[PDB]
Every structure is written in structure tokens, then in C-alpha cells.
Amino acid sequence: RANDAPIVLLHGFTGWGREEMFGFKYWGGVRGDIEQWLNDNGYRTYTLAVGPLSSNWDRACEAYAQLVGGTVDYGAAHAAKHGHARFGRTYPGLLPELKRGGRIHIIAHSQGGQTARMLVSLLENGSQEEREYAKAHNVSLSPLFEGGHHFVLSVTTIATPHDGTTLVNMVDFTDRFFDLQKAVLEAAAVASNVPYTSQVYDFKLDQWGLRRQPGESFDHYFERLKRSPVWTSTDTARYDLSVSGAEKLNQWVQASPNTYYLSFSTERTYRGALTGNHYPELGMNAFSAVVCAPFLGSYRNPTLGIDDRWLENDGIVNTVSMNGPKRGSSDRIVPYDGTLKKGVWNDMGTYNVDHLEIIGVDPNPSFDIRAFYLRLAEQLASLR
Amino acid sequence: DAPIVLLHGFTGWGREEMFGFKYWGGVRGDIEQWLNDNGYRTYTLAVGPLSSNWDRACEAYAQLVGGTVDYGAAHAAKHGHARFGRTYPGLLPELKRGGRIHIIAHSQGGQTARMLVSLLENGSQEEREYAKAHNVSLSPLFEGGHHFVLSVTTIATPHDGTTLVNMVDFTDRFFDLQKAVLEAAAVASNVPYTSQVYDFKLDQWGLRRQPGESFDHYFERLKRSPVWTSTDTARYDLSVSGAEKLNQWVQASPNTYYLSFSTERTYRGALTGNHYPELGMNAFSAVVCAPFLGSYRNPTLGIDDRWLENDGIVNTVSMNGPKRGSSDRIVPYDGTLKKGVWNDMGTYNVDHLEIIGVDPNPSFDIRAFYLRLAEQLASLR
Ligand SMILES: [Ca+2]
Ligand SMILES: [Ca+2]
Ligand SMILES: [Zn+2]
Ligand SMILES: [Zn+2]
């Protein structure tokens, strides 16, 4: 121990706030509540809750405002390009002292990892698209695009598609993605064919002008979300989750030399005897084992360099993708030797735990979830 | 300030259940949400609807302070169900060490909230003696000298029982009520649901709805089960003679403020004295219950004309405070809340289900009723 910085949890393409999903936690699922375990052991922990289906850009902006307070500013240039509100919601700020000079650790799961890397990237460097635009059109700029804000001491990514996931290429992907979404609903005891009055699981699509209406089931809403810009356009989680889009992301989102990056990879498959294809183990969450993993560990594509190294998977994301960014990237990934190195991806290795088990959404009695996150917190509680 | 704790009666369910249709607010919205947004620390219990006040008190205790539910070795030995129940994390563990709550209970809730105070305050000697005799642990609930309640508020509670239990076709009609309350949340009693929807919380009895089993079919099994056929049921405590037996040992503590809201939705016939439901009474009570409630006499039981004014569910005279087998004192509201007695807050022109929003009533300002009560309860902290 000798940094005191809070931990900040960050979900992926599925995820909600503490008040949401009737208290059923993204971080902990059926195992309990990970934020609470940490706080009770004296690691101060806060939870971010951004647009699950939105782009990493949108989510970083949302994430910044949630962190220091204010209205979400997606950028005038960006807003004009993609045709959506410049301005979002207002947040009181979890840590407004961070302007004056605190520090955070981000712990991020799934696509959260991409959004954490880009939050840090934008914090340090800004965007010269938004800078040039603002002076061109004589409007204001969110401090997020100025640069010189260095306040993230660590990004820890867990089961993140740094190079993408190959699931995106699946033939029925659009439909099966929203079935994943409905599965995670069921996991939380929430049904998709009933008009919940309460918002329950808010997708936070204020920018796009999309909300679930009174008397609208999730099935219906998702059926509308499929035909919408949040599934259709460039500016989406779907896009940044494909192998090509992660590629574009990687090309501009580099590791801050002032941040400690950590990666945890996941696996819940075994190699074939005569092939190299991967197959889901007994105990992989039902939805992934049936719908997703067969494709994930058989899909080969010589054009995109998708060979045997991509087949091992955690039921959702190709395991090789979680090391750190590689495709389109300059960053350096090193195996964990004992001392966590700065400005580089410290590969903490691979765990026999599926995309939903590591967060607790699917059970795994063999995997001690509490010990994994408490072990992590203490690694993070060592310093610069 | 003291947090506020909402407690349902012989029907009720936690916030996640009934697809988010709230027992406390029904069609009118979310009473607990209203109390939090107006800045009253407010929580919601979901104990077993059909279970006895003893059981549901033991559960409420564990939901509050944390732990695994212990029904008492003597109690369990005596009725033939599991001693230990669900393990809860706890809403307000601070109650063991300094804290305080305001209980607001509806319908049978008010029996439960009182039996919860009496147990905290004086324990149970029976369990205490049984523990010496059989080498078993005792729950803190049965020790005595815990006194963290502060206020109990009963809205429409059958403190002297309801006369409805005496109905000839009660078993079948009670569960029809249960399934009308299902229908008010847009839940169907014939749909073979897979989601839990409404957990009757009968672990101790070893009873559970089977997936793909309708409430129709489940409720048939429940009627033939010990949570309907035993002495240890909501049904027996709901009885006039079961309430009396409760009242004989569940006193009012000097250390707590009790508040009673009575409720009426009937008009008196000029000749007979019988009572008939007002227009706009929830259709089910109007048809199925109030005519009986309004006409049922039995002078062995002491069921006078006095008993005929009703809620639709409960007899109005049963609601101001325990009396049959009670020494609890009952004063009508003099402007200032007295301690260790029932403060009778009057009678309101609202159904048993309307008073919690499960059935419409435009002329009833339900949001203003409960906000008002909150202050009254905060005139204390
Ligand atoms: Ca599993
Ligand atoms: Ca009505
Ligand atoms: Zn955008
Ligand atoms: Zn019992």
C-alpha cells in the first residue's frame, strides 16, 4: 500500500447502474456485489454506468461527466458527423476533486476495456478534430478534448476485445446479440415480454433520441433498436467490437506512458484432438455454449489474419484478443514477471473462467470471485 | 430521523416481483419511491404472505438486521416445519447497535409489526426454556431487551381478526382474491410462467411453484397444504379467535408509538343495520366479500351490528387497535401523538386495496396521505 486512489468499475456492451435491474449487480451477479466487497476491505470503489450499446467515444464522454460532474459533451464535430445531440445528461460528479488533483484506477470488463483506454487517451491528448472544429465554428470545447488531464493511474481490463471479437462475423449476429441481451435480463430475473413501468435497464440513448416507452416490452424495444442508428451506423459498440473497428480504434488509442495497464484474459474451451478448433467446456453459461462458442472456435478467415490463435475463447470474445491491443497497435504487452510496469500492458495471464463468470453473472463454484477482485485491488494499491 | 419500513399483509411481494407492479402503490405508482424523493429514508420488506405472523416476524427480523432466519426450535418442533429459513444480508444492521425504524404496515402487516415489537422487547420464554431443555441455540429475537422499533403504524389491519374467514366458501374465495391481485398486476393465474413472478416464500414448508405450473394449479396444492390447514397460518391469525389469541400475548410496549388508520367503504341500511359496498369499491370485494362482511352475525362470537361496517376485506371496528384479549389502551388523535398506546388517526373512505393503490380512487390523494404520515412519524425522528 501507498497510493490511496479510488477504484472505478466499468461495464461492457451489457451493463447498468446499482439502482437499476432491481439491485442485481453487473459487478457480482449471483455471487453478490463486488463494489461492496472492496469498500468493506478498505478499497474505496465506485461504479460507472454508461451506454451499453453506444460507441466507445460516446461512452468515454459519458464516463468523464459521470466522474467530474457536468453535462455530457460528445463534441460538436462528432455530433455533426454522426447526426446526434452534442449534449447528454447531467451527473452530479462522483469525484469532482479530480479536476484539482486526485487519481483513479479503472477496472473494466469486456468493451469497458476499450472505453477505459480511450478515456485515458482523450484525457491526455484530446482530439484535434474537436479542437480544429471549435475554432472553425467559434464554439466551446469540452476539456476532454483539450488534453493535459493525466488523472488515471491504472486501466485494468478483464476479458476485453482489444483486437475485437469474431462473433461479430456470425450470420445471425444481430439477432443473437440481442438474445445475449435478453439472457442477461433473465439472469437478473427480468423478463423481456412484459411492459415494465420502471425503466429497469436504461440504455441511455438520450443522444440518439431513443427510450423504451411506457407499455413497451424489452423484446419490442430491441426490435426497434435493431433498425436504429445505434445498431446501423459507424458510431456504435457493434462497430468498435468488430475486428476492423477495434483496429481503427487501436490506431489512435495508445497507452499513456503515465498509466499502468493490466490485462486479464479468459478461456472456457478446450482444443480439438485433430483440428485446433475450440469447443465449450461443461459449465460455460448456457447461452454462450449453444449460440456463440461453436462459431467462435471454428471461424477462420485468412483475409483478416484469423487463424488457430483466434479460436480459444471465453464464450464471447476470442482469448488472444485480451492480452492488449495488437491489430493496428503500437503498445507493448509484457508477461507479468512480478513487478507491474508502467506505460505497458502487464499481461496477468489467462483464467479458466467464461465471459459471464468473471463478473458473477453466471455461477462457477470452482472460481473464487471474491479472492480475484480483492487480489487485484491490492495489486492496484501498489504505486507509482 | 429513523428509516421507514413498509410491511405488506396476506398479499405482498418485493420490488423485483410482479414485473415491478408495487404492492405499495399499485396502479397509482410507487409509494416508497415518493417517500425517498421527498427525503424520507424508506425501505420495503417482503415476508411470506400466507405464513403466520410468527413466521413472517422471524423473517422480517432477519431481513432487517441480517442473518439466517430462525423460527425457533420450540416453534418448529411444534408445527412441523424447518427451523431455519433464508439468509438475508440485512437492510439496517445498525439496529443492533443504536438504530431506529418506523414500521408502516397494511392489512395483516399490523399483526406482524406488533408481534415483531413484542418479540424484540420480551423474547419468548417458551423458546428460552426449550433451549435449556434440548441443547439448541436461541436467536437474539427471543432473548428480550432489544427495543429498536420506535413507531408502528397499522392501516386497515384486522387487530381483532376479520369476519371474512367465517365465509362458507372461504378457501376458494380467498385464493380468488389472491388471483384478482395477480390480475391487477397483469399476471394470469392460468399462464405456465417460467420466471418466479410471485414467490410465496414457503421454504420452511417445503413448498414452491414448479416451473411451468400455473398459479391456478399451485394454489390448488396450497389449499391442501399445511400453510392453509394448520394452526401456524395467516388464515388462523386472520380469524377472529386467532386474533384474540394473538392479542392475549402481543401487548404494546411502553417504548413505542403506535398509530392506527381505520378504513370504510360502505353505507348502512336504514332498517337492518347491514352494510353495503359504495360504488367504486374494488369489483372483487364488492361482489365476493362485502355483502357477507356487511351481514354476518354470530352472537356466540359476539359479532354485533358493530362489525358490519367494512373495508371490503376487514371489519372496520377491528382496525383501531387490538381489543379482544388486549389491555392495549386506545386514544383518538388529540393533535399530539401519545406513547405506549394506540393513537387512533380516524377512519378514511377508501378500500382495503385502494389505500395502497392496488385499485383506483381519483378522489383519494394517496400520494398526499403517505407524505403526511411521514412527517407525523418524523415528529419524533
Ligand atoms: Ca457456469
Ligand atoms: Ca375504485
Ligand atoms: Zn457518438
Ligand atoms: Zn411457523
Closest partner CB to A22 (pick from B15, B186, B196): B15
How far, in Å, from the CA of B159 to the mean position of ligand 2? Answer: 24
In angstroms, the CA A364 to CA B381 distance is 45
Under 8 Å CB pairs connecting chains A and B tally to 20
How buried is residue A125: exposed, middle or buried, by Cβ count under 10 Å (0-12/13-18/19+)?
middle
Query: Tell me, what DSSP letter sits at residue B344?
Result: E
- Give chain A's domain count: 1
Q: Sign of torsion, CA B249 B251 B256 B258?
A: positive
Query: Tell me, what DSSP letter sits at residue B39?
Result: T
Kind and range of the H or E run holding B331 = strand B330-332
Question: Could you tell me if B23 and B15 are in contact, meaning their C-beta atoms sit under 8 angstroms apart?
Answer: no
Question: Could you tell me if A191 and A200 are in contact, meaning their C-beta atoms sit under 8 angstroms apart?
Answer: no
Question: Could you tell me if A367 and A357 are in contact, meaning their C-beta atoms sit under 8 angstroms apart?
Answer: yes
- Phi, psi of A329, rounded to the nearest 5 degrees: -115, 155
B27 lies in which domain range?
A: 1-381
Q: Which residues does chain B have within 8 Å of residue A193's beta carbon, measured at their own beta carbons?
A: none
Q: Is A23 on the interface with B (CB under 8 A)?
A: yes
Question: Could you tell me if A296 and A318 are in contact, meaning their C-beta atoms sit under 8 angstroms apart?
Answer: yes
Q: Is A338 on the interface with B (CB under 8 A)?
A: no
Angle (CA) A49-B63-B376 rounded to 5° is 90
- The residues near A247 (Cβ < 8 Å, ≥ 6 apart) are A163, A164, A327, A328
In angstroms, the CA B209 to CA B199 distance is 8
Q: Sign of torsion, CA B164 B169 B174 B177?
A: negative
Hey, is B101 helix, strand or coil?
strand
Contact A197 B21 (CB under 8 A): yes
Q: Taking Cα atoms as reference points, which of A9, A115, A121, A14 lies closest to residue A57?
A: A115
Kind and range of the H or E run holding B105 = strand B101-106
Residues facing residue B330 across a β-bridge: B342
Query: Tell me, what DSSP letter sits at residue B278?
Result: P
Query: Tell me, what DSSP letter sits at residue B236?
Result: H
Question: Could you tell me if B380 and B337 are in contact, meaning their C-beta atoms sit under 8 angstroms apart?
Answer: yes
Q: How far is CA B39 from CA B33, B44, B95, in A?
A: 10, 15, 20
- Phi, psi of B176, rounded to the nearest 5 degrees: -55, -40
Residues facing residue A262 across a β-bridge: A156, A346
Q: Closest residue of B to A200, CA-based?
A: B20
Crossing angle for the helix pair B53-65 and B109-122, to the nearest 10 degrees: 70
Crossing angle for the helix pair A112-125 and A243-252, to the nearest 10 degrees: 20
Hey, is B207 helix, strand or coil?
strand
Q: Which residues does chain B have within 8 Å of residue A186's beta carbon, measured at their own beta carbons?
A: 195
Angle (CA) B147-B153-B154 rounded to 5° is 125
Question: Could you tell me if B41 and B79 are in contact, meaning their C-beta atoms sit under 8 angstroms apart?
Answer: no
In angstroms, the CA A351 to CA A163 distance is 19
Q: Report, in angstroms and rounded to the nearest whole number, the Rg of chain B calculated over CA atoms.
A: 20
Q: Report, in angstroms and rounded to the nearest whole number, the Rg of chain A calculated over CA atoms.
A: 20
In angstroms, the CA A271 to CA A274 distance is 9
Q: Which amino acid is at B234?
A: A
Residue A75: CB atoms within 10 A of its CB come to: 24
Question: Could you tell me if B238 and B109 are in contact, meaning their C-beta atoms sit under 8 angstroms apart?
Answer: no
- Phi, psi of A158, rounded to the nearest 5 degrees: -130, 110
Question: Could you tell me if B64 and B91 are in contact, meaning their C-beta atoms sit under 8 angstroms apart?
Answer: yes
- Phi, psi of A304, rounded to the nearest 5 degrees: -85, 10
- Phi, psi of A48, rounded to the nearest 5 degrees: -90, 150
Residue B332: CB atoms within 10 A of its CB come to: 11
A79 grid coordinates: 455530433
Query: Tell me, what DSSP letter sits at residue B287?
Result: I
Q: Is B223 on the interface with A (CB under 8 A)?
A: no
In angstroms, the CA A247 to CA B177 distance is 60
Q: How far is CA B17 from CA B89, B113, B173, in A?
A: 19, 22, 23
Question: Could you tell me if B17 and B46 are in contact, meaning their C-beta atoms sit under 8 angstroms apart?
Answer: yes
In angstroms, the CA A345 to CA B10 distance is 58
Question: Could you tell me if A153 and A104 are in contact, meaning their C-beta atoms sit under 8 angstroms apart?
Answer: yes
Hey, is B313 helix, strand or coil?
coil
Q: Which residues does chain B have within 8 Å of residue A198's beta carbon, measured at their own beta carbons?
A: 20, 30
In angstroms, the CA B260 to CA B7 distance is 14
B69 grid coordinates: 432466519
In angstroms, the CA B79 to CA B71 distance is 11
- Looking at chain B, list the stretches that DSSP marks H as alpha helix, in order from N- to C-terminal side: 31-37, 53-65, 73-79, 109-122, 125-134, 170-184, 215-223, 226-229, 234-238, 240-247, 283-284, 290-293, 366-378
Residues facing residue A306 across a β-bridge: A301
Q: Which residues does chain A have within 8 Å of residue B15's beta carbon, measured at their own beta carbons?
A: 22
Q: What share of chain B is helix, strand, coil (3-state, %, to 5)?
A: 40, 15, 45
Q: What residues have a C-beta under 5 A from ligand 1, the ion?
A: A 283, 362-364
Residue A332: CB atoms within 10 A of its CB come to: 12
Q: What's the longest Cα–Cα distance across chain A?
A: 64
Q: Which of A33, A185, A198 to mutate to test the interface with B (most CBs of B within 10 A)?
A: A198
Q: How far is CA A258 from CA A61, A120, B98, in A?
A: 21, 10, 47
A11 grid coordinates: 461495464
- Report how far apart the first and last C-alpha atoms of chain B are (Å, whole number): 4
In angstroms, the CA B103 to CA B92 distance is 13
Crossing angle for the helix pair A56-68 and A112-125, to the nearest 10 degrees: 70
Q: How far is CA B99 from CA A380, B3, B92, in A?
A: 36, 9, 8
Hey, is B330 helix, strand or coil?
strand
Q: Closest residue of B to A188, CA-based?
A: B16
Say what the alpha-carbon torsion angle A347, A352, A353, A354 is, to the nearest 10 degrees.
100
| DSSP codes of every residue in B215-228 | HHHHHHHHHTSHHH
Residues facing residue A182 across a β-bridge: none
How far, in Å, from the CA of B27 to the mean position of ligand 2? Answer: 11
In angstroms, the CA B57 to CA B232 distance is 13
Crossing angle for the helix pair A173-187 and A218-226, to the nearest 10 degrees: 150
- Phi, psi of B267, rounded to the nearest 5 degrees: -130, 145
H/E/C letters for each residue in chain A?
Answer: CCCCCCEEEECCCCCCCCCCHHHCCCCCHHHCCHHHHHHHCCCCEEEECCCCCCCHHHHHHHHHHHHHCEEEECCHHHHHHHCCCCEEEEECCCCHHHCCCCCEEEEEECCHHHHHHHHHHHHHHCCHHHHHHHHHHCCCCCHHHCCCCCCEEEEEEECCCCCCCHHHHCCCHHHHHHHHHHHHHHHCCCCCCCCCCCCCCCCCECCCCECCCCCCCHHHHHHHHHCCHHHHCCCCHHHHHCHHHHHHHHHHCCCCCCCEEEEEEECCEEECCCCCCEEECCCCCHHHHHHHHHHHCCCCEHHHCECHHHCCECCCCEHHHHCCCCCCCCCCEEECCCCCCCCCEEEEEEECCCCCCCCCCCCCCCCCHHHHHHHHHHHHCCCC
Conformational region of residue A22, where left means phi above 0, alpha means psi within -120 to 50, and beta covers everything else:
left
Hey, is B100 helix, strand or coil?
coil
Residues facing residue B150 across a β-bridge: B101
